[PDB]
Amino acid sequence: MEHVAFGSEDIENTLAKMDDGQLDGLAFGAIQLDGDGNILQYNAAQGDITGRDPKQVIGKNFFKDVAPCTDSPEFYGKFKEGVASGNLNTMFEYTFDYQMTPTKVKVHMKKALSGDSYWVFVKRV
Numbered sequence: 726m727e728h729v730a731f732g733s734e735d736i737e738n739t740l741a742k743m744d745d746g747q748l749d750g751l752a753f754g755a756i757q758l759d760g761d762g763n764i765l766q767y768n769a770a771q772g773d774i775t776g777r778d779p780k781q782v783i784g785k786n787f788f789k790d791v792a793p794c795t796d797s798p799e800f801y802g803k804f805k806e807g808v809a810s811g812n813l814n815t816m817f818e819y820t821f822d823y824q825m826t827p828t829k830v831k832v833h834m835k836k837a838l839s840g841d842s843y844w845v846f847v848k849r850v
C-alpha cells in the first residue's frame with residue numbers, strides 16, 4: 726500500500742511522482758480531472774467505494790455523466806471556482822447516491838502540482 730495520508734499538506738507533490746499502478750496502492754479514492762471535469766485517472770480504491778470500474782469511467786465527464794449528484798454549487802460550483810481562481814484546496818463532506826447505496830464521504834479537492842489538472846480525493850466517513 727502506498728504510504729500517503731488523506732489530507733496531507735503536500736499530497737499533490739507525492740502524487741505527481743506516481744504512475745497509475747502506484748495510484749491504485751493508495752488508501753483512499755483518487756480521481757484526476759482536467760479543468761472541464763473529464764476523468765484522467767481513477768484509482769482502484771475509488772472503484773471500491775462507488776462500484777464503478779476504473780477502466781470504464783476514464784474519459785467520461787465526472788459532473789455530467791458519472792456523478793450527477795455532484796453537479797451542485799456545493800461540489801461542482803467549488804470545483805469551477807477553484808479552476809478559475811487557480812487556488813483549489815477545499816475539504817467537505819458529501820453523500821454519493823447515484824446508482825449506488827447512499828454513501829457518506831469526505832472529499833478533498835486540490836489542484837495538481839503542475840496546476841493544469843485537479844484531484845478529487847475521497848474517503849468513507
Ligand SMILES: *C(=O)/C=C/c1ccc(O)cc1
Nearest residue numbers: 775792793794795821823
Ligand atoms: C453522485 O451522483 C455521485 C456519484 C459518484 C461519485 C464518485 C464516483 O467516483 C462515481 C460516482
